[PDB]
Amino acid sequence: DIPQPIRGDKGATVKIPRNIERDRQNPDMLVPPETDHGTVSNMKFSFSDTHNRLEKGGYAREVTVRELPISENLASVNMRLKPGAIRELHWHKEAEWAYMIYGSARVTIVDEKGRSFIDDVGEGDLFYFPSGLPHSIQALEEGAEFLLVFDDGSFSENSTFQLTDWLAHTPKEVIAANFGVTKEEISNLPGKEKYIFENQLPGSLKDDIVEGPNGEVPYPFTYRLLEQEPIESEGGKVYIADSTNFKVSKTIASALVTVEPGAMRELHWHPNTHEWQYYISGKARMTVFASDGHARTFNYQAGDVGYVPFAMGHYVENIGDEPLVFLEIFKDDHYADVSLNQWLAMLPETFVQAHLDLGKDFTDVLSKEKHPVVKKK
C-alpha cells in the first residue's frame, strides 16, 4: 500500500507530488521513531545517485565529501572491470583500501625501495596501497567488481596520477634523456590517459613475478579476510582486519559484518574515530545518537554508504528477510568499540540500577562477554 508520514496522532498524509518508491526504501525517515530528536547531519548516500564513468573495459563511480559532507576523512569508489581489463598504472596522495565483492583481479605495487609485489585477489579478499605508492588492477577471466576506500573525503578519481598522463605532459626531450633513448623511440606514447582500457587476459601469476636486487616486500599488500576465523555470536559474524593482522593497513581498519534476519549489530560506540559504512547486501536501519538529546534514524540497503561520527552511539538492525552484510571502515591503526551491554555488565549492579531505575531483573541479563551481533528472542 501507500505509506504516509503518520505516527499515532502525529504527521499527516502527503498532499503534493512525491517519490513513493524512495519513501518505501526509507520507512524510518518518512516515519522516524518517536525517540529521534533534533538536527543531525545526513548519514546516508546511494551510489545509484552518482554519475557513473563508463570506459571501454568497465566503470567507476564515487561517493565523496561532495556527496556526503559529514564524511570528510573517507571517500569511496565502486569500480567494475571486464575480463582482462586494466585499471591503468597510477598513484594518489591518499592510501587506498579495497574489498573484492565480485570476481577476481591481479594487482601490482612497487614500494619506496623499488621492491615489487604482484598477487591475485578473489571474492572476500582485501588489498591496501600505502599513500603515494604506484599500483594497478587487472581483472581475470570472470571480470571483477570491488569497493575502493580512500583516506581523504576530498578524493576524486578523475584527479589521481596516471602513468600515461604524466608522460603525455613531460617534454619529449626529457623523457628521452630520462631513459637514454631517442625522441623517435617514444613517438608512439599515448597523447592522453587511458584510465581503464581493454586488454587480453594475463598469464599465470607465477610468470608475472619480477625478481629484484632489493628483495621481497616485508609484508603482503593483500589479505584473505574471509579465510580468517570470524567472531561468532548468535545472530551473525564479524571479520576484522586492521594493522594488527593485516600488517600494511596502517591508516585503515575494517570489519565485514553479517547479520541474520531478526538480528542486529548491538548498541555500541567507537572511542577512537569515525565509522564509514558500505552496505553490500540486505536492508538495515541505524539510529545515530549525537549527544545532548539528539538522535536521527537512517535506512540503508545494497549500494548505500553510511556514516557515524566519532564516539556517537549506534546499532545496525536487519529489517529485511535476507542476510544483512556491510563493511565498517575506520581511519585508524586498529579496530575498537565499547559495547553498551558489556560496559554495564562490568559495573556493580546497584550502581546500574540507580542509573536506569530498573531492578535485578534487568541487570541479570547483562553479559560480560562481548557479542557484536545479537538475535531477537
Other CB atoms within a 10 A radius of the CB of residue 222 amount to: 21
Among positions 34-73, residues that touch a second copy (CB under 8 A) are: 34-42, 44, 46-59, 61, 65-67, 69-70
Query: Is 241 among the residues that bind a second copy (CB under 8 A)?
Result: no
Query: Is 30 among the residues that bind a second copy (CB under 8 A)?
Result: yes
Is residue 268 part of an annotated ligand binding site?
Answer: yes
User: In whole angstroms, what is the distance from residue 286 CA to residue 266 CA?
Assistant: 11
Is residue 294 part of an annotated ligand binding site?
Answer: no
**Which candidate in 55, 145, 157, 328 is catalytic?**
328
Binds a second copy by CB under 8 A, chosen from 1, 2, 180, 227:
180
Binds a second copy by CB under 8 A, chosen from 74, 98, 101, 308:
101
Is residue 135 part of an annotated ligand binding site?
Answer: yes
Nearest to 372 by CA among 284, 259, 279, 295: 259
Q: Which three cell numbers stand for residue 270?
A: 567507537
Interacting partner of 217 out of Co ion, a second copy, none (Cβ under 5 to 8 A depending on kind): none
Q: Which three cell numbers stand for residue 283?
A: 536492508
Interacting partner of 178 out of a second copy, Co ion, none (Cβ under 5 to 8 A depending on kind): a second copy
Is residue 270 part of an annotated ligand binding site?
Answer: yes
Q: Which three cell numbers stand for residue 118?
A: 604482484
List the x/- string, 261-280, binding to Co ion by CB under 5 A: --------------x-----
Which residues touch 252 (CB under 8 Å, ≥6 apart)? 95, 97, 128, 149, 151, 242, 329, 330, 331, 332
Q: DSSP assignment of 70-128, as one string? A: T-SS-EEEEEEE-TT-EEEEEE-SS-EEEEEEEEEEEEEEE-TTS-EEEEEEETTEEEE
Q: How far is the CB of 286 from Co ion (least distance, A)?
A: 9
Q: How far is the CB of 367 from a second copy (least distance, A)?
A: 9
**194 near 164, Cβ under 8 Å?**
yes
Other CB atoms within a 10 A radius of the CB of residue 20 amount to: 11
328 tagged catalytic: yes
Binds a second copy by CB under 8 A, chosen from 87, 92, 237, 331:
92
Among positions 185-244, residues that touch Co ion (CB under 5 A) are: none
Binds a second copy by CB under 8 A, chosen from 76, 88, 140, 195:
88
User: In terms of CB distance, is 30 or 79 closer to Co ion?
Assistant: 79
- b/e 307-327 (16+ beta carbons within 10 angstroms → b): bbbeebbbbbbbbeeebbbbb
Q: How far is the CB of 181 from a second copy (least distance, A)?
A: 6
What is the H or E stretch that residue 180 is in?
none
Residue 369 half-sphere exposure toward CB, CA atoms < 13 A: 7
Other CB atoms within a 10 A radius of the CB of residue 261 amount to: 16
Is residue 275 part of an annotated ligand binding site?
Answer: yes
Query: Is 266 among the residues that bind a second copy (CB under 8 A)?
Result: yes
User: In terms of CB distance, is 229 or 368 closer to a second copy?
Assistant: 368
Among positions 82-111, residues that touch Co ion (CB under 5 A) are: 96
Q: How far is the CB of 160 from a second copy (least distance, A)?
A: 6
**121 near 68, Cβ under 8 Å?**
no
Is residue 169 part of an annotated ligand binding site?
Answer: no
Which residues are catalytic, by number? Answer: 328
List residues forming the annotated binding site for Mn(2+): 90, 92, 96, 135, 268, 270, 275, 314
